[PDB]
Amino acid sequence: SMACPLEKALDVMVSTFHKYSGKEGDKFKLNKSELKELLTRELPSFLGKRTDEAAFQKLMSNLDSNRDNEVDFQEYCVFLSCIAMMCNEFFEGFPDK
Amino acid sequence: MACPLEKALDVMVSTFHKYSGKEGDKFKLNKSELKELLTRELPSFLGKRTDEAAFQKLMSNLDSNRDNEVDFQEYCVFLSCIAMMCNEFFEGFPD
Ligand SMILES: [Ca+2]
Ligand SMILES: [Ca+2]
Ligand SMILES: [Ca+2]
Ligand SMILES: [Ca+2]
């Protein structure tokens, strides 16, 4: 847990996904309803107030690459990687350098 | 010039037309003009990522009206989305 923080990160990546994907419908994929709870309860700093729905449909449409109205674990990792790639750039001072 | 927030509004309008008037519609960006604007005007936004498949995804994620182009409205939405994100790390997102 503490002796390997990078391992604990991969745990909460798989567990947080299934924390909501199994609430309704396909137990292995996130619908628009489950994508809303996961981002709200687990990534609160990312959203802010938000709740524009249309932008949520845009976010749901951008993540859903295969166009099946769901977010599988593949697209779930791409979205997290895109956020981490930004956290890396702003660590290097993107808007100020 | 004298006011920085004013020049910020001026550069966003001029930078858009700095590339939109090159090919086709004079007021809408195509995929080539969008790539010139991102690489030349926002280099640190994309760390020299050359993935054409991923660049097309950003092109479709911005083309909200599905006209294969990026007008000024979608140009402002994308810039505000970036600015809103800069704000989160300023305040302290994973930190
Ligand atoms: Ca589900
Ligand atoms: Ca999907
Ligand atoms: Ca054009
Ligand atoms: Ca458009």
Swiss-Prot record, chain A:
It comes from the Eukaryota. The keyword DNA-binding does not apply. Keywords: Acetylation, Calcium, Cytoplasm, Metal-binding, Nucleus, Repeat, Secreted. Coiled coil: none annotated. Ca(2+) 1 binds at residues 29, 34. GO terms for biological process: epithelial to mesenchymal transition; positive regulation of canonical NF-kappaB signal transduction. GO terms for molecular function: actin binding; calcium ion binding; calcium-dependent protein binding; chemoattractant activity; identical protein binding; RAGE receptor binding; RNA binding; transition metal ion binding. Ca(2+) 2 binds at residues 64, 66, 68, 70, 75. SUPFAM superfamilies: EF-hand (SSF47473). The keyword Heme does not apply. The modification N-acetylalanine is found at residue 3. One of its GO terms (cellular component) is extracellular space. Ubiquitously expressed. The modification N6-acetyllysine is found at residues 8, 36. Its main location: secreted. Residues 13-48, 51-86 form the EF-hand domain. It holds the Pfam family S_100. It is found in: Secreted; Nucleus; Cytoplasm. Homodimer. Interacts with PPFIBP1 in a calcium-dependent mode. Interacts with PGLYRP1; this complex acts as a chemoattractant that promotes lymphocyte movement. Interacts with MYH9; this interaction increases cell motility. Interacts with Annexin 2/ANXA2. Interacts with TP53; this interaction promotes TP53 degradation. Interacts with CCR5. Interacts with FCGR3A; this interaction inhibits PKC-dependent phosphorylation of FCGR3A. Calcium-binding protein that plays a role in various cellular processes including motility, angiogenesis, cell differentiation, apoptosis, and autophagy. Increases cell motility and invasiveness by interacting with non-muscle myosin heavy chain (NMMHC) IIA/MYH9. Mechanistically, promotes filament depolymerization and increases the amount of soluble myosin-IIA, resulting in the formation of stable protrusions facilitating chemotaxis. Also modulates the pro-apoptotic function of TP53 by binding to its C-terminal transactivation domain within the nucleus and reducing its protein levels. This is Protein S100-A4. It comes from Homo sapiens (Human). The gene is S100A4.
